[PDB]
Design a protein around this ligand. Structure first.
Ligand SMILES: O=C(O)Cc1ccc(-c2c[nH]c3ncc(-c4ccc5ccccc5c4)cc23)cc1
Length: 280
């Protein structure tokens, strides 16, 4: 038996679920579309094998983090019942539109920002924010797929391909392989916003090794057609030196109070009062 925390359900079994189709295979297992036999509703169920593991689960609730309903385990597998977020991946919409308008992009960046800031206040670092970790809900609000699995305890192939790697934003410090502090999430935020405005990740290249080389050595070139506030924020968030990066000295308060997010009422944002610019 593995300790799963307060969300643990000693009664729940795989026999309670009707699995329909595979949702998505990640680094830490597989996610499947399942309909509860009794309750008659749809859940995204993440399954991870117990032989893959070498104080493991710490679920955090937030209007912009996916909700963990309960968790259960068999002799071989672990199950994590999550909200089925149906609005589709944010970056699917991005591809279909080539890029986002600034008010649109700000909205999404702001919702992600708040969730990251809240986690840091509880001494939790997101570590590896990816476009595949960002979804919109039925209404059009940002939902992050991370629910609290201790990632530094799961055996998985992190092997990187030569051309056309898995979309991910590796900060300069992560490439040097230095411990994750909060400021790594701010780089990821900046990279998410960069891609939202420009259509591709910062320092992008078809060659993965060339891409890493850019991240480390090539100066951040921001093309025109974005506002000064957007320009200044990206310059701040995509600082290669993490002691100079925006949100180094005062974390979320540096992002929250930035001129780019002037139009954001953060109280209304968490309370989902600002209606999403796009409805799925
Ligand atoms: O597996 C990993 O490591 C990382 C990871 C990835 C995803 C999720 C995830 C939790 N809940 C979810 N609900 C829905 C979806 C989802 C996916 C594709 C869709 C395509 C079209 C329309 C709706 C779609 C919905 C994905 C999740 C959790 C962990």
């Amino acid at each position: 038996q593995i300790n799963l925390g307060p969300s643990s359900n000693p009664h729940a079994k795989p026999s309670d679920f009707h699995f329909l189709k595979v949702i998505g295979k990640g680094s830490f297992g597989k996610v499947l579309l399942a309909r509860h036999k009794a309750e008659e509703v749809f859940y995204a169920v993440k399954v991870l094998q117990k032989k893959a593991i070498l104080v493991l689960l710490k679920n955090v609730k937030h209007p912009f983090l996916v909700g963990l309903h309960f968790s259960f385990q068999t002799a071989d597998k672990l199950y994590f019942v999550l909200d089925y977020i149906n609005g589709g991946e944010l970056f699917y919409h991005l591809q279909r539109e080539r890029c986002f308008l600034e008010p649109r992009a700000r909205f999404y960046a702001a919702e992600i920002a708040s969730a990251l800031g809240y986690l840091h206040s509880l001494n939790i670092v997101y570590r590896d924010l990816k476009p595949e970790n960002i979804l919109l809900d039925s209404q059009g609000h940002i939902v992050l797929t991370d629910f609290g699995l201790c990632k530094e305890n799961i055996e998985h192939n992190s092997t990187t391909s030569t051309f056309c790697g898995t979309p991910e934003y590796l900060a300069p410090e992560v490439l040097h392989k230095q411990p994750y502090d909060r400021t790594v999430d701010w780089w990821c935020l900046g990279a998410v916003l960069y891609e939202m405005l420009y259509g591709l990740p910062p320092f992008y290249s078809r060659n993965t090794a060339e891409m890493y080389d850019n991240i480390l050595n090539k100066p951040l070139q921001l093309k025109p057609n974005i506002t000064n506030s957007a320009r200044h924020l990206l310059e701040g968030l995509l600082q290669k030196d993490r002691t100079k990066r925006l949100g180094a000295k005062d974390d979320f308060m540096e992002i929250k109070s930035h001129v780019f997010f002037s139009l954001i009422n953060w109280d209304d944002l968490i309370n989902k009062k600002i209606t999403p610019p796009f409805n799925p």
